[PDB]
Amino acid sequence: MSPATSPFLATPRTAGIVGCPFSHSGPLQLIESGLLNDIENLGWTVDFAGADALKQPRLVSRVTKDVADRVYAHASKGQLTVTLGGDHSLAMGTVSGTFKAYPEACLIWVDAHADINTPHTTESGRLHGCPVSFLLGLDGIPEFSWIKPCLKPERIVYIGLRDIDAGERKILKDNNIKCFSMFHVDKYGIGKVVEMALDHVNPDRTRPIHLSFDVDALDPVRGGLTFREGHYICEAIAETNLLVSLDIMEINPAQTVDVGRSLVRCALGETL
């Protein structure tokens, strides 16, 4: 079973907030929308640097390193780091910092896309579908030196997959990565899916959890997670007390701000 209280966090509960608008204005809108106050109402103390805190590989590395550092700063302090993102490639940074601080963490990746392409399978070229390939370590080394492969393939699980967008269906099977696609969600229901996901990466419920949630996995033809399912993922993870890092990615400014806000509150311990 899971611990009655978090074995990782700092005794004065602190939410670290890092926004990175790389791709939009969604992280700023969410911040404008009362997210900070919501978090505080739940008994959390907020560490936010203020609303100024927020191929093309040359620049994709810079920003992700920036994120990797800020995330670790919060991570190395017992905070739960909430990364408010644009692009999911930013998970290169968020996961680096988190695993830097928690080498024994596991990663739950919620997205319609596997984002697992090597630069040798990319074809598109946008670093958007490559971040997992660097974290798993098969890069190809060049101007991505700060990245150490901090993620074993048995430590990642995917929920919500539908279009393999730069996330090769061969790469996934070669490295034996557990994937729960929309077919499996339909089949089993999100209830059983989340439990199987937890049992795969975290069977003894003793590993810190990194929940990297991309809002593109959601829906308002109608083939993504419902809002309720995206919410249950956040609740179910929350009930374990194992969560140390939360990404809310690709927010994109209509009521996807209110959705992002709801999932944050939920992930942080709004049980209701």
Side-chain angles (χ1 to χ4, degrees), residues 32 52 83 147 159-160 163 175-176 183 194 201 266:
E32 293 178 40
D52 309 337
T83 314
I147 293 182
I159 296 166
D163 182 66
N175 297 267
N176 203 10
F183 170 85
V194 175
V201 296
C266 197

mmCIF file of all heavy atoms in Angstrom, residues 32 52 83 147 159-160 163 175-176 183 194 201 266:
data_model
loop_
_atom_site.group_PDB
_atom_site.id
_atom_site.type_symbol
_atom_site.label_atom_id
_atom_site.label_comp_id
_atom_site.label_asym_id
_atom_site.label_seq_id
_atom_site.Cartn_x
_atom_site.Cartn_y
_atom_site.Cartn_z
ATOM 1 N N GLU A 32 -2.372 33.976 -13.621
ATOM 2 C CA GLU A 32 -3.282 35.106 -13.472
ATOM 3 C C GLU A 32 -4.639 34.667 -12.913
ATOM 4 O O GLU A 32 -5.332 35.464 -12.285
ATOM 5 C CB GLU A 32 -3.523 35.755 -14.839
ATOM 6 C CG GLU A 32 -2.346 36.460 -15.492
ATOM 7 C CD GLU A 32 -2.730 37.014 -16.863
ATOM 8 O OE1 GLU A 32 -3.858 37.549 -17.021
ATOM 9 O OE2 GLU A 32 -1.914 36.890 -17.796
ATOM 10 N N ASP A 52 7.570 37.216 -13.852
ATOM 11 C CA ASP A 52 8.687 37.362 -14.783
ATOM 12 C C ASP A 52 9.566 36.116 -14.755
ATOM 13 O O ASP A 52 10.580 36.049 -15.445
ATOM 14 C CB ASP A 52 9.518 38.594 -14.445
ATOM 15 C CG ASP A 52 8.673 39.826 -14.287
ATOM 16 O OD1 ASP A 52 7.555 39.832 -14.843
ATOM 17 O OD2 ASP A 52 9.122 40.778 -13.608
ATOM 18 N N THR A 83 5.600 22.339 -12.759
ATOM 19 C CA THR A 83 6.048 23.011 -13.977
ATOM 20 C C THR A 83 4.870 23.283 -14.894
ATOM 21 O O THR A 83 4.160 22.350 -15.340
ATOM 22 C CB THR A 83 7.145 22.272 -14.748
ATOM 23 O OG1 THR A 83 8.164 21.837 -13.844
ATOM 24 C CG2 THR A 83 7.767 23.207 -15.772
ATOM 25 N N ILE A 147 22.706 16.849 -20.259
ATOM 26 C CA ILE A 147 21.753 15.763 -20.081
ATOM 27 C C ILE A 147 22.441 14.428 -19.832
ATOM 28 O O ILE A 147 23.154 13.905 -20.695
ATOM 29 C CB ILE A 147 20.799 15.626 -21.278
ATOM 30 C CG1 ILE A 147 19.878 16.842 -21.355
ATOM 31 C CG2 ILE A 147 19.977 14.350 -21.156
ATOM 32 C CD1 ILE A 147 18.865 16.781 -22.480
ATOM 33 N N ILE A 159 0.197 6.926 -20.557
ATOM 34 C CA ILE A 159 -1.251 6.836 -20.474
ATOM 35 C C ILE A 159 -1.831 7.872 -21.402
ATOM 36 O O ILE A 159 -1.466 9.063 -21.292
ATOM 37 C CB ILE A 159 -1.740 7.164 -19.057
ATOM 38 C CG1 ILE A 159 -1.197 6.117 -18.081
ATOM 39 C CG2 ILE A 159 -3.266 7.211 -19.014
ATOM 40 C CD1 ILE A 159 -1.305 6.487 -16.609
ATOM 41 N N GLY A 160 -2.747 7.449 -22.283
ATOM 42 C CA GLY A 160 -3.477 8.359 -23.157
ATOM 43 C C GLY A 160 -3.031 8.348 -24.610
ATOM 44 O O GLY A 160 -3.569 9.088 -25.440
ATOM 45 N N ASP A 163 -1.943 8.978 -31.238
ATOM 46 C CA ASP A 163 -1.074 9.167 -32.396
ATOM 47 C C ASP A 163 0.406 9.144 -32.014
ATOM 48 O O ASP A 163 0.911 10.068 -31.371
ATOM 49 C CB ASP A 163 -1.409 10.438 -33.194
ATOM 50 C CG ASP A 163 -0.524 10.603 -34.430
ATOM 51 O OD1 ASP A 163 -0.627 9.771 -35.358
ATOM 52 O OD2 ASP A 163 0.273 11.564 -34.479
ATOM 53 N N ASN A 175 12.447 -1.262 -26.327
ATOM 54 C CA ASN A 175 12.902 -0.933 -24.978
ATOM 55 C C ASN A 175 11.921 -1.375 -23.902
ATOM 56 O O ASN A 175 12.083 -1.042 -22.728
ATOM 57 C CB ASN A 175 13.199 0.561 -24.858
ATOM 58 C CG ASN A 175 14.333 1.001 -25.770
ATOM 59 O OD1 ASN A 175 15.493 1.031 -25.360
ATOM 60 N ND2 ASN A 175 14.002 1.334 -27.018
ATOM 61 N N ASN A 176 10.914 -2.130 -24.326
ATOM 62 C CA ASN A 176 9.925 -2.721 -23.427
ATOM 63 C C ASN A 176 9.265 -1.734 -22.457
ATOM 64 O O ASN A 176 9.155 -1.982 -21.251
ATOM 65 C CB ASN A 176 10.527 -3.901 -22.675
ATOM 66 C CG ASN A 176 9.470 -4.861 -22.172
ATOM 67 O OD1 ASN A 176 8.281 -4.763 -22.529
ATOM 68 N ND2 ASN A 176 9.895 -5.807 -21.346
ATOM 69 N N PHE A 183 -7.068 2.825 -26.430
ATOM 70 C CA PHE A 183 -7.636 1.479 -26.576
ATOM 71 C C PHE A 183 -7.690 0.773 -25.221
ATOM 72 O O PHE A 183 -8.725 0.264 -24.831
ATOM 73 C CB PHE A 183 -6.806 0.683 -27.592
ATOM 74 C CG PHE A 183 -7.143 -0.784 -27.663
ATOM 75 C CD1 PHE A 183 -8.189 -1.241 -28.478
ATOM 76 C CD2 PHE A 183 -6.386 -1.722 -26.968
ATOM 77 C CE1 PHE A 183 -8.473 -2.615 -28.586
ATOM 78 C CE2 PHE A 183 -6.673 -3.085 -27.064
ATOM 79 C CZ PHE A 183 -7.720 -3.525 -27.869
ATOM 80 N N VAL A 194 -4.736 3.151 -14.242
ATOM 81 C CA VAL A 194 -3.819 3.853 -13.364
ATOM 82 C C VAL A 194 -3.194 2.895 -12.352
ATOM 83 O O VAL A 194 -2.029 3.012 -12.017
ATOM 84 C CB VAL A 194 -4.493 5.026 -12.620
ATOM 85 C CG1 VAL A 194 -3.510 5.639 -11.617
ATOM 86 C CG2 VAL A 194 -4.953 6.048 -13.630
ATOM 87 N N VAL A 201 5.568 0.745 -12.662
ATOM 88 C CA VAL A 201 6.749 1.547 -12.352
ATOM 89 C C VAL A 201 7.003 1.661 -10.851
ATOM 90 O O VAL A 201 8.099 2.020 -10.424
ATOM 91 C CB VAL A 201 6.715 2.967 -13.008
ATOM 92 C CG1 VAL A 201 6.740 2.855 -14.524
ATOM 93 C CG2 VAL A 201 5.489 3.758 -12.532
ATOM 94 N N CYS A 266 -5.959 19.262 -7.643
ATOM 95 C CA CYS A 266 -6.244 17.873 -7.473
ATOM 96 C C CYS A 266 -4.979 17.074 -7.204
ATOM 97 O O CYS A 266 -4.916 16.254 -6.280
ATOM 98 C CB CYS A 266 -6.849 17.404 -8.781
ATOM 99 S SG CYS A 266 -7.672 15.897 -8.610
#
